[PDB]
Design an enzyme around this catalytic site. Sequence first.
Site, PDB file in Angstrom:
ATOM      1  CG  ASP A 150     -42.626  85.407  82.897  1.00 19.67           C
ATOM      2  OD1 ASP A 150     -42.189  86.451  82.146  1.00 19.67           O
ATOM      3  OD2 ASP A 150     -43.674  85.472  83.509  1.00 19.67           O
ATOM      4  CD  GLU A 155     -45.777  76.885  84.562  1.00 18.81           C
ATOM      5  OE1 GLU A 155     -45.117  77.764  84.435  1.00 18.81           O
ATOM      6  OE2 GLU A 155     -47.329  77.342  84.572  1.00 18.81           O
TER       7      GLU A 155
END
Length: 434
Positions: free
Chosen positions: A224, A215
């Site tokens: 994202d 991540e």
Amino acid sequence: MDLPPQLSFGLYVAAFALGFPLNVLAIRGATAHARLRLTPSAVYALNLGCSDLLLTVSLPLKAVEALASGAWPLPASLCPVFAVAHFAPLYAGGGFLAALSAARYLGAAFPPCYSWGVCAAIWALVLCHLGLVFGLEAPGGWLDHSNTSLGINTPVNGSPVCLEAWDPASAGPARFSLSLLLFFLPLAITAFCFVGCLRALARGSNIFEMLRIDEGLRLKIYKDTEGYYTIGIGHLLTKSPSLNAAKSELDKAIGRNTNGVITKDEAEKLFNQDVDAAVRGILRNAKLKPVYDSLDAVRRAALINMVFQMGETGVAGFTNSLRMLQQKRWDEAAVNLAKSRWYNQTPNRAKRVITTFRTGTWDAYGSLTHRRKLRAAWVAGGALLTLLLCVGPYNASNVASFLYPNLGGSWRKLGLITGAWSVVLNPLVTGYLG
Ligand SMILES: Cc1cc(OCCCS(C)(=O)=O)cc(C)c1-c1cccc(COc2ccc3c(c2)OC[C@H]3CC(=O)O)c1
Ligand SMILES: CCCCCCCC/C=C\CCCCCCCC(=O)OC[C@H](O)CO
């Protein structure tokens, strides 16, 4: 069962010819590493390199001795220098190999002055031991009141022998004792460390480091890959097309007017909450719970990883893979998951998680600490191999002919040759070439 003298000669010459450059390169690598950083492993490798180079330089004398069928065809006064140059390394090497493998093991499983002291002790032991027995009890030694050169027996007229015709009643207890202390004990240390390195890899990481890798970390709101507002360690704020809604959820989750920017401590707190949520999501899902419960630690992390990324319901739709995982049918599970949209959308991460399901190791996650642990395992494994193959047979021969002096000299001769090839195999396993 006697080797032709030419074969022996050739075998010693090959070890010499290869061992000289190999150990010059090893010493250089080790010397560059200590001088730049300064670490235990480098010190042990330097000592092992120097000792192997000393052994190497003695080998031509062993070679010509072989060609002379055991007779010493050199000045008698060379015999004591040869004695020390040949046999001190043959015993010291195992000590340094064990030290190196223990330094690598400890440095990686639990991430200067000691090192040098340890090496001094190894040298002190080998030199006092060999020196005191030799000085006292060799032909021409202190106890010998004859006209004999130090270290030379003469079994028949015109046939002097350096060391190898020494009374076993003196040489045998000395060999035997030192083989136990400086080979068999190091062997056991090296095996122990090798096993320790493997166990360290098996349990050398966890879900937190694994998801950090997957991540990353951002302190400001970003979109994202799908384009959703996200923060910290892959924390989805909202699917909504609204920065304000994203700021509002951020502020709510922390307890503060963040204005879309957070500290590393806060990101870390959220990450913790997200992993607990992903774990609670698994435990309250009838399809996920039994799979999770049946899994080892490393594969639990992979399953947590999937749930962290896709949520409990998304993961629970993989009914076939889940079934496979519970049945410990790893490869079948992987084949299923590879067909997923997940694999199609995020293939690098999906390969990493799936490989983790196939192997049950952390190998797909090549973090610095994992590679250091791998490095350590290879060094201890290599050390174990060179101990067993090279100086092993020599030291086992020492033990055997002590316990069974009825044994002929054949096994010792071969053990000496394998021992000499440690100058080749040692620099190759310690990891300091180039
Ligand atoms: C003690 C000594 C004295 C010495 O005097 C030279 C001057 C001659 S004068 C002026 O006085 O006439 C020179 C040296 C080099 C030494 C020495 C110092 C340290 C270790 C060793 C090696 O000792 C071994 C070598 C192999 C073996 C030894 C000892 O034991 C058994 C077998 C090993 C095996 O078969 O496995 C010599
Ligand atoms: C200390 C005196 C030793 C002489 C006895 C000879 C017997 C040979 C047996 C084992 C040698 C290897 C022992 C293990 C040494 C490794 C120590 C290490 O890992 O060092 C890391 C660091 O320096 C820590 O602060």
